[PDB]
Amino acid sequence: DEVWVVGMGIVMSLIVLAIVFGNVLVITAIAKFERLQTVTNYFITSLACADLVMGLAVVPFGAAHILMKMWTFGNFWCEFWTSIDVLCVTASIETLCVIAVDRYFAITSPFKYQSLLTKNKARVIILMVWIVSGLTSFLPIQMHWYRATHQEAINCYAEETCCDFFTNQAYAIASSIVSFYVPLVIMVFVYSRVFQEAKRQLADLEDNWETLNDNLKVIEKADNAAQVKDALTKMRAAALDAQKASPEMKDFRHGFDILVGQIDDALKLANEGKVKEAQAAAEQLKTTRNAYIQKYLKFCLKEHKALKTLGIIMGTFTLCWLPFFIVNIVHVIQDNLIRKEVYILLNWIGYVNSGFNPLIYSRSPDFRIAFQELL
Numbered sequence: 001d002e003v004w005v006v007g008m009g010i011v012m013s014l015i016v017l018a019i020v021f022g023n024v025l026v027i028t029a030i031a032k033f034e035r036l037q038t039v040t041n042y043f044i045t046s047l048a049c050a051d052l053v054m055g056l057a058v059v060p061f062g063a064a065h066i067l068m069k070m071w072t073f074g075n076f077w078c079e080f081w082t083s084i085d086v087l088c089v090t091a092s093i094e095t096l097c098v099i100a101v102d103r104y105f106a107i108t109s110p111f112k113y114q115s116l117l118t119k120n121k122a123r124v125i126i127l128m129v130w131i132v133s134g135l136t137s138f139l140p141i142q143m144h145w146y147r148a149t150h151q152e153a154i155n156c157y158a159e160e161t162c163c164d165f166f167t168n169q170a171y172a173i174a175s176s177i178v179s180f181y182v183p184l185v186i187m188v189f190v191y192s193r194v195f196q197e198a199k200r201q202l203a204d205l206e207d208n209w210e211t212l213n214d215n216l217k218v219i220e221k222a223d224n225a226a227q228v229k230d231a232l233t234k235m236r237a238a239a240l241d242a243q244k245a246s247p248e249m250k251d252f253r254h255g256f257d258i259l260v261g262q263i264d265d266a267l268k269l270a271n272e273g274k275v276k277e278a279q280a281a282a283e284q285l286k287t288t289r290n291a292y293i294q295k296y297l298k299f300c301l302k303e304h305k306a307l308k309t310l311g312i313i314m315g316t317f318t319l320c321w322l323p324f325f326i327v328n329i330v331h332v333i334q335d336n337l338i339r340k341e342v343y344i345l346l347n348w349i350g351y352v353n354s355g356f357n358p359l360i361y362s363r364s365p366d367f368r369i370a371f372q373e374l375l
């Protein structure tokens with residue numbers, strides 16, 4: 001009855017408002033605030049602008065299509081709205097793939113990251129992704145490569161009020177497979193590699209710092225200056241290697257200058273035949289170890305949290321769009337065992353994940369503070 005129509009309309013309008021508000025908040029936070037113009041944040045901007053465009057151009061239109069039960073904007077605008085929908089979905093998934101690739105760098109080769117990857121390069125690659133998505137969406141649709149041979153589709157291609165998405169056995173596969181799965185597979189593999197490599201860079205920081213913790217304890221349990229020499233020299237090598245071992249490393253690099261001097265102060269006292277007060281000189285090493293192990297816990301957790309947050313973004317996008325593409329694949333291999341409403345339901349879950357991205361960004365402290373300061 002009309003009660004269900006009104007309830008659906010109000011909840012879907014709330015969905016529209018949430019999506020638009022979150023996406024414009026993300027765009028404003030990136031554009032205005034001076035601390036939110038990193039190369040990754042440009043890709044976040046691309047994802048948010050794709051989400052905002054999808055919202056404005058699709059969600060009210062799809063709502064009208066499923067509430068009025070018939071399209072009321074013409075065949076051209078129907079073919080344009082479907083093109084926008086496919087374009088925005090492909091742009092979102094490909095932008096997530098590019099985000100994963102970007103996080104493959106700056107975790108593997110930051111030296112090549114902050115050298116040849118700048119804001120201009122980020123803009124170029126973002127426009128390249130958008131052009132590829134626009135091609136693969138508009139062209140097969142605009143030049144009518146998706147037209148279905150089944151007669152009611154031909155009726156709706158000239159009905160001027162029927163906007164049912166009927167596709168042949170080619171656009172279904174050669175669209176779902178490519179647009180979702182290829183960026184999906186690439187992004188999943190690349191981000192799994194990113195997570196494994198992050199678990200490895202942290203491990204490398206540790207093993208190097210693990211021996212510094214160990215050789216610190218043996219200093220107190222020492223009789224003469226012979227072993228404090230062995231402990232301090234290798235510890236100096238560990239400190240130098242740790243100094244040799246990205247953004248926010250400015251604090252990291254500067255601290256090691258203080259660190260290395262401490263061993264030289266202790267080692268020189270050790271290199272005199274006198275150890276009892278060089279024992280006391282190594283006591284300050286605990287203060288340094290406690291002060292920077294704190295800094296590293298903090299930065300690693302901020303990095304682990306940021307990596308998880310991008311991981312939560314990719315995971316929620318996958319979990320909200322995979323059912324739709326799965327039922328698309330299994331729907332066209334056979335003769336329509338899936339009702340349209342279930343198809344619409346899963347497609348609209350994929351629609352409504354668009355507002356999930358700003359919420360997940362709010363998990364990161366920086367984006368949360370930026371959004372709070374905007375509001």
Ligand SMILES: COc1ccc(CC(C)(C)NC[C@H](O)c2cc(O)cc3c2OCC(=O)N3)cc1
Pocket residue numbers: 081082085086087089090163164165167171172173175176179180328340344347
């Ligand atoms: C009642 O009739 C209709 C009318 C409209 C719609 C919405 C639709 C336009 C299908 N949304 C498109 C969807 O987002 C999508 C995205 C993508 O990247 C690739 C593909 C894709 O559709 C299926 C495909 O074969 N490819 C659903 C039912």
